[PDB]
């Protein structure tokens, strides 16, 4: 996933360069694990809203015949309703009824009685195909882009069969199902998806509009430091890479601009980078400010301040935070016997 920020490893040369060298990032997971292929595809998802509890209808029969002798009834002594809860993991189902709270088979169950026992697609129709993007690397797929644009890796992700559909569970928890994801690893069942509702997806479609604004931002400082032949210190943060990888440093020194080639490494809280008010960690040691001026728009404040990095914007972040809440994963049932 995107991080908060992005600090470079550690700076090795300041070598001035032209304005019009400067090129925003235009940083993307896909091409960042080796992926620029870029297919549309249908996958399946959970029906949005709250789905769970499927809460299975079924007949008691008391001593095939059973079946005529309920649609008899609804125009052996059948006892109905009896409803009984369904896990949707293993298709397992559950009421006290059943000899020791569980029937998992696959049509008929049996009961705490010899004498009177205990379709099954209506009640296990829970998914919606929707149309998604899988990046390529020729024949592997590195991740996929859902329908509202959010990237997912495979990395990490499992095999998980809800509801008698085979289908993988990613990192962050959720699920889908497409043909051939090629996925190794086979989730041990402890293992939970989550819920699609729509804030999901509504927080989902804000980051990812919120990060196509980062880059649209970038692109028009950039368009205003060509037609204006000057550069505003600040505005060099614009051009740091949003995720981890190898890229470019931009400072304002000696009154010129300048470069660097640098590895970004993750930032997923503010107190790694800036330990000591005044020290701004890259690398092992802290590095020297001079004149004012940091890199990448980091500024040495004027009085009273210290390294000021954009630490204001904070909207990626808010819609981040509100994502990581909203998320609520899919328990299983309990288990009831005598």
């Not at 360069?17 to 997971?29: A, E, G, R, T, V």
């Not at 209808?57 to 309920?70: E, K, V």
Request: hydrophobic fraction near 35%; proline fraction near 6%.
């Amino acid at each position: 996933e995107f991080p908060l920020y992005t600090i470079p490893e550690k700076i090795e040369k300041w070598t001035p360069i032209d304005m019009i060298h400067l090129s925003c990032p235009n940083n993307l997971l896909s091409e960042e694990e080796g992926c620029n292929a870029e297919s549309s595809f249908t996958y399946f998802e959970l029906k949005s809203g709250y789905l769970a509890h499927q809460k299975v209808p079924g007949f008691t029969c008391t001593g095939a015949a059973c079946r005529d002798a309920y649609n008899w009834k609804v125009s052996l002594l059948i006892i109905s309703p009896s409803i009984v809860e369904m896990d949707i993991y293993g298709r397992t189902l559950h009421s006290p009824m059943f000899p020791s709270g569980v029937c998992s088979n696959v049509p008929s169950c049996e009961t705490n009685h010899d004498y009177t026992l205990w379709s099954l697609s209506l009640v296990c129709d829970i998914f919606t195909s929707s149309n998604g993007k899988k990046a390529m690397n020729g024949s592997r797929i590195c991740g996929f882009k859902d329908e509202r644009g959010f990237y997912r890796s495979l990395k990490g992700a499992c095999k998980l069969t809800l509801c008698g559909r085979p289908g993988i569970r990613l990192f962050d928890g959720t699920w889908v199902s497409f043909t051939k994801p090629d996925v190794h690893v086979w989730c041990t069942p402890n293992q939970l998806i989550n819920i699609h509702n729509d804030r999901l997806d509504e927080i989902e479609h804000l980051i990812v509009e919120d990060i196509i604004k980062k880059r649209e931002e970038c692109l028009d400082t950039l368009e205003t430091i060509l037609m204006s032949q000057s550069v505003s210190f600040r505005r060099l943060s614009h051009f740091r890479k949003l995720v981890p990888g190898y890229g470019k440093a931009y400072t304002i020194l000696n009154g010129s601009l300048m470069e660097t080639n640098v590895y970004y490494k993750r930032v997923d809280k503010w107190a790694d980078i800036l330990p000591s008010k005044g020290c701004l960690k890259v690398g092992q040691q802290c590095m020297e400010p001079v004149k004012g001026v940091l890199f990448n728009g980091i500024i040495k404040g004027p009085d009273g301040q210290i390294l000021i990095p954009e630490m204001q914007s904070e909207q990626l972040k808010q819609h981040m935070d509100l994502l990581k809440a909203a998320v609520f994963p899919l328990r299983h049932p309990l288990i009831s016997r005598e």
